[model samples]
Structures are given as C-alpha cells and as structure tokens.
Target: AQAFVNSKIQPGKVVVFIKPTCPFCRKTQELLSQLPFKEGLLEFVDITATSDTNEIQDYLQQLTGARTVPRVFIGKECIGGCTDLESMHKRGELLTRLQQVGAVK
Candidate 1:
C-alpha cells in the first residue's frame, strides 16, 4: 500500500485525492485548472471509486494525519488540502513550491 502511494507521487506530478461529492474537492479542482500549468499535469483520484479505498484512506491518514478530502501532493511532498493550498496560493508561495519540485517554470 505504501508502495502504491509512493508510485503516485512522481516528480513533476501534482496529485490530488478527492471525494467526488466533496465541495472542497470541487473547489480544489477548479483552482487547479486555473493554475499556470499545462493540461494533464494534474491528476485527480476519486478515493471512493478506488478498489483499495480503505487502504488508501488509512495510508493517507498515516502519512499526513489529515483525513480530509483534496489531500494534495507536489511530487513526494504532501502540501495539504484545499484550505492550505488556497492559503499558499493567496500568499504567493504555491508557485515557488511547485517550481522547487519542477512542476512548473
């Protein structure tokens, strides 16, 4: 399960774990689309639809200690959920972090 999670957090990738019905997840998706990045750079995973839902959920909790929707990752680092992400964006730190991970210019 850890291996599976690790595989998803690839360099240059922006991964988001979301629940389909979550409002924050929807907001996060919209924000991600508006970010200065090429299409296909963002990968959204619907946790409820995954086969290993429980395992993934447990893994995320153990990893980030936040059992929340829109759990986001920039490469191997867990940058956090919608609120944290939005805060970073508003503070102008999101782009720098993305660039540090080579996810953007």
Candidate 2:
C-alpha cells in the first residue's frame, strides 16, 4: 500500500507516530535525538495536529488495529510506543535496527 510505503519505505530507517503534546511522544523524540544518527535519519509524524491524520490513522488501524500514539516502525517492524522504545533502547536492539538499515553505525 502507498500509505505503508510512505511511512515505511523512507530514505530514513525509522518512522515514529506521535501527538504534539503527549509526554511519551516527547520522550520518544528525545531518545531519537540522543542517538548517533543524522538529523534526517528519522521521520516523525505528528498525528495530533495534521489534518490528514484521520486518513493516516485509518491506515494505521487497518495495518496494526490500534489507536495508540507514538507507534513506531523500524524498517517495517511495529515497535509500539514510548515504553516499547525504552525497552528496545535498553536491550540495544533499537540501535541495532538502525544500523541494519544503514542509518547508523
């Protein structure tokens, strides 16, 4: 699907789902910033403020069947939310995934 490709098949390796004011979303973005990658290595979608979010949300629901914020995907793998992001970081797999996609070391 085009929606999936637009969100997943990026020059960057990662895509993050978030809302403008969500604390969890903020933390997730912060974590990405702290990582050793180019600024453009990650793509962020602010689902809360965009007018086309409803359409994207519909696609998300169809793909993942959830309405959760901060939904992350690393090269097409659904990585869930802030807690999920933290878990991946703690396990070192997040960075590993980034490296796998040539986005990092």
Candidate 3:
C-alpha cells in the first residue's frame, strides 16, 4: 500500500489525480493553491507523464472502482472528480475534510 501510494499516489494527505494538459486539472491546481494548503500537504499525480499511470488507474479501480480523471482522495476516502471537488468547496466541507486528515493544523 505504501509503495502504491508513494510511487503512484504520492505521499500526501490529499492526493489529486490530474493530467497536465487538462484545463480542468489546471483549474483544480489553482483552486488548491487558493485553499491555503501548506507546502508538501498535497500530492499531484500527472497521469500523462507517469509510466505507472495504468497501474495507478488499476489500483484506483480496486480501491474506488471508478475510472475517471481528476480523482481526488483525501486520506482514505474517494472524493470523486472535479465537480465533486467544487461541490465540497461550495458546501464548506473541503477545508474541514483536510483538517480531519491533519493536512492542516
């Protein structure tokens, strides 16, 4: 699990799956920045560049059973994709969720 999360998932309390060329991915990145996450609090996986992207996808399939881009997983929970992310933000759940995982103090 550590290898899976470290190599493919990245060791962060909040891990965001993204494609570098995706506009939605870019927007998510900007949103993360605005959320006031401290350095190293988040992990970014660029599926477009990672050679192990398929493996990551497979893992996600087993973990969340979903095949989708911009999958956001906070701690051990599947937070779904971009729309879900925005909803969390609007509903004021995003930051609270982050804090739950100790991503923020």
- Measured against the true structure, the TM-scores of the candidates, in listed sequence, are 0.86, 0.80, 0.79
- Evaluate all candidate structures by whole-model CA lDDT and list the values in order: 0.83, 0.75, 0.73
Best candidate (score: lDDT) = 1
Q: What would the per-residue lDDT of candidate 1 be over residues 14-35, giving only the tens digit for each residue?
A: 9998887789999999988777
Superior by TM-score: candidate 1 or candidate 3: 1
lDDT of 3 at 46: 76
Query: In candidate 2, residue 27 scores what lDDT?
Result: 90
Quote the RMSD, in angstroms, for model 1: 1.8
- Candidate 2 residue pairs in backbone clash: none
Q: Which stretches of candidate 3 lie over 4 Å from their true place?
A: 6-12
Better of 2 and 3 by TM-score: 2
Q: Give per-residue CA lDDT, model 3, range 14-71, as digits (tens).
A: 7888876777777777777676666777877777675777776677777777856777
lDDT of 2 by residue, 1-105 (tens): 335436453544788887777898899999997777766667877775656776777777776777677888776767688898899889988877787778874
Off by over 4 Å in 2: 1-12
